[PDB]
Design a protein around this ligand. Structure first.
Ligand SMILES: O=P(O)(O)OCCNS(=O)(=O)c1ccc(OC(F)(F)F)cc1
Ligand SMILES: C=C(/N=C/c1c(COP(=O)(O)O)cnc(C)c1O)C(=O)O
Ligand SMILES: c1ccc2[nH]cnc2c1
Ligand SMILES: c1ccc2[nH]cnc2c1
Ligand SMILES: [Cl-]
Ligand code: NA
Lengths: 267, 393
């Protein structure tokens, strides 16, 4: 019930959620676990965590390079599940969402994938290259194992898509800020007020805005636009990349950034 | 919701980020509309005939079948403008792009034939063309880089991953996912998300239609088998389509065996990989135990791809088509044999199809058989590659 509980608490506090993304195992397993503890300590309300994939087609160069770093450290999905179990054992209530590509979910059986997610205490799974039209076995397996399947509401969404996303998704609704792929260098729009409004009309899971969110101003703006919160990936990953030789400075600058981004979610 | 079936059995689908679904739905609708439009069909036929040079010859081998009971014909897609079959469907997709009010084209290329076809069609029809090509292929198929640029296309080397076709495909799709409002993605094989495997087949099917007419005229009967190389699947499905309901006609597709299947350095996912989801489709792919996509390998850039189009995976599963592999050395020998004994320089991709037909003849030289090899392109782009190797030997 972790997302439901989070949004209820945030609502009571008149706060948006701030949700960082990192790649699991970037730049190694031990440093990644410290990064994630830093993000939480600095005020992350939830996590979105990528499992390294060979060909991440929804990602721009910054997160492509995060994936490549994890691979250079020998990170596999099995090691990611060990990390996730350790994260949950430390942090019982934070919502944990995975960013997956379809092949990694399909590989050893869709059902088996969601069952593993349940065993380690994952709350949600977003499969980036499975649109609602192809989602049936993924959403069925997710709900059978008490995992929230996350769906995307793009800026080009029509009414049929809004209704499907509202119906099929759980946890949160992903409100895409723009077309294209992940990247801090491509700033998205303000949340589409009409889309936020239609999602609320249709009783969709609360919206988190993502793609191109890299500054406290954008977080504040998402909240004001009526989104429940915002996700930032590339901006966080840039701080890892810049500080590979300076792990202590890396954690200091991650704490500073996350704290600032979270402070902007307070209304 | 689609107008046409996105699946071939279990294979195919539309496994793209949600952002791209309206674009794929738009393309499907514009194709269905075009296919019914006599004006579109007349424009397409005119370009094929008077610009591209169709119909292409069907040549009977004079020398390479001597002392056997094999009669071998070559469907001469090497004579098409641009130098390969890729030109056929590019002319069709360029006209669709215009029909949808797009002004820019994105394409991937490995052999550079698809890129050359995309650039020539963009130059003729007034589209701005950008091509992604892996850096390894920029080197081994460089004559094509020179041709694309002279025709005004922007050519973007891809250094990521294997620096070959898969990596070019990735970058083209990433680009499209931001640029679809104004750019059409001119996918250059019978693979990827629906509706591309269907569109590419329908815009390549004249290969098999002409072949059937030509062989009936010359021989008075259908071939015993038609044989085509399979990199993504376009030339092969274009040759196979009009023969699928002629159940006596064998359909043989030839994947690259690289340095040998047993080395793991090949490009033969249909027979040696496992179903997965990548590049928009559920299809056989070369993948690790953990589900990461492998890198393929072939001497020929145009077959160096670790997946394959879903209609071929379907035709294989039901037993309608058979798929085999040919190694780099077998392809090189077939290249040399065609140049010296028939005076035709074939693409190294097409040499894999010819090598398998030569095996069919040489293994059973008193078997009476009428074969057609799709000679999918000419080998000008490969002469430097092959020269180096033969001199060294
Ligand atoms: O801040 P940025 O621009 O790096 O964006 C980070 C987003 N990371 S994520 O896991 O939410 C995420 C969410 C959706 C993605 O693709 C999809 F929309 F097609 F589904 C990819 C990554
Ligand atoms: C990779 C490319 N070409 C592939 C190719 C192929 C393999 O692609 P299909 O499987 O899509 O036919 C076959 N024959 C020729 C002459 C080719 O050039 C390309 O031109 O981009
Ligand atoms: C015709 C139209 C749409 C379809 N979806 C699946 N099969 C189909 C056939
Ligand atoms: C395989 C994959 C993509 C391709 N684009 C052009 N030819 C191809 C073969
Ligand atoms: Cl340090
Ligand atoms: Na292939």
């Amino acid at each position: 019930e972790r997302y439901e509980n989070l949004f209820a608490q945030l609502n009571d506090r008149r706060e948006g959620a701030f949700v960082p993304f990192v790649t699991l195992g970037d730049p190694g397993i031990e440093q990644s676990l410290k990064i994630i503890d830093t993000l939480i300590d600095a005020g992350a309300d939830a996590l979105e965590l990528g499992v390294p994939f060979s060909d991440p087609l929804a990602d721009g160069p910054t997160i492509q390079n995060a994936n490549l770093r994890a691979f250079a450290a020998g990170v596999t999905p099995a090691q990611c599940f060990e990390m996730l179990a350790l994260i949950r054992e430390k942090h019982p209530t934070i919502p944990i969402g995975l960013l997956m590509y379809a092949n990694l979910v399909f590989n050893n059986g869709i059902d088996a994938f969601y069952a593993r997610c349940e065993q380690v205490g994952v709350d949600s799974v977003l499969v980036a290259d499975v649109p609602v039209e192809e989602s049936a076995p993924f959403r069925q397996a997710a709900l059978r194992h008490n995992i929230a399947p996350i769906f995307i509401c793009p800026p080009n969404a029509d009414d049929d898509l809004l209704r499907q996303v509202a119906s099929y998704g759980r946890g949160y609704t992903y409100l895409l800020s723009r077309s294209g792929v992940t990247g801090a260098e491509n700033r998205g729009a303000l949340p589409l007020h009409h889309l936020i409004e239609k999602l609320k009309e249709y009783h969709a899971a609360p919206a988190l805005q993502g793609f191109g969110i890299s500054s406290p101003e954008q977080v504040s703006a998402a909240v004001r636009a009526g989104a429940a919160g915002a996700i930032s990936g590339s901006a966080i990953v840039k701080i890892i990349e810049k500080n590979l030789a300076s792990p202590k400075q890396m954690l200091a600058e991650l704490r500073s950034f996350v704290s600032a981004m979270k402070a902007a979610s307070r209304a | 919701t689609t107008l046409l079936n996105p699946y071939f059995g279990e294979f195919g689908g539309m496994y793209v980020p949600q952002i791209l679904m309206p674009a794929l739905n738009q393309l499907e609708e514009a194709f269905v509309s075009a296919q019914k439009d006599p004006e579109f069909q007349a424009q397409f036929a005119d370009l094929l005939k008077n610009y591209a040079g169709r119909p292409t010859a069907l040549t009977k081998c004079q020398n390479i079948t001597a002392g056997t009971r094999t009669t071998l014909y070559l469907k001469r897609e090497d004579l098409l403008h641009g130098g390969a079959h890729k030109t056929n469907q590019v002319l069709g997709q360029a006209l669709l792009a215009k029909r949808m009010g797009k002004s820019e084209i994105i394409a991937e290329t490995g052999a550079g034939q698809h890129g050359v076809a995309s650039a020539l069609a963009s130059a003729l029809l007034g589209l701005k063309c950008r091509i992604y090509m892996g850096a390894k292929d920029v080197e081994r198929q460089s004559p094509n880089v020179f041709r694309m640029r002279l025709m005004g296309a922007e050519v973007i080397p891809v250094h990521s991953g294997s620096a070959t076709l898969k990596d070019a495909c990735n970058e083209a799709l990433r680009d499209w996912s931001g640029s679809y409002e104004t750019a059409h993605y001119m996918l250059g094989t019978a693979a990827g998300p629906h509706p591309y495997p269907t569109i590419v087949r329908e815009f390549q099917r004249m290969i098999g239609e002409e072949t059937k007419a030509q062989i009936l005229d010359k021989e008075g009967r259908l071939p015993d088998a038609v044989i085509a190389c399979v990199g993504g699947g376009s030339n092969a499905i274009g040759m196979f389509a009009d023969f699928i309901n002629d159940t006596s006609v064998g359909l043989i597709g030839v994947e690259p065996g690289g340095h040998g299947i047993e080395t793991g350095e090949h490009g033969a996912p249909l027979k040696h990989g496992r179903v997965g989801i990548y590049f928009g489709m559920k299809a056989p792919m070369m993948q690790t135990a953990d589900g990461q996509i492998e890198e393929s390998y072939s001497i020929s850039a145009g077959l160096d791809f670790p997946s394959v189009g879903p209609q071929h995976a379907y035709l294989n599963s039901i037993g309608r088509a058979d798929y085999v592999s040919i190694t780099d050395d077998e392809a090189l020998e077939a290249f040399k044999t065609l140049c010296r004994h028939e005076g035709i320089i074939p693409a190294l991709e097409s040499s894999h199809a010819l090598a398998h037909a030569l095996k069919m003849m040489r293994e059973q030289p008193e078997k009476e058989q009428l074969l057609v090899v799709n000679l999918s392109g000419r080998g000008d782009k490969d002469i430097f590659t092959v020269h180096d190797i033969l001199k060294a030997r």
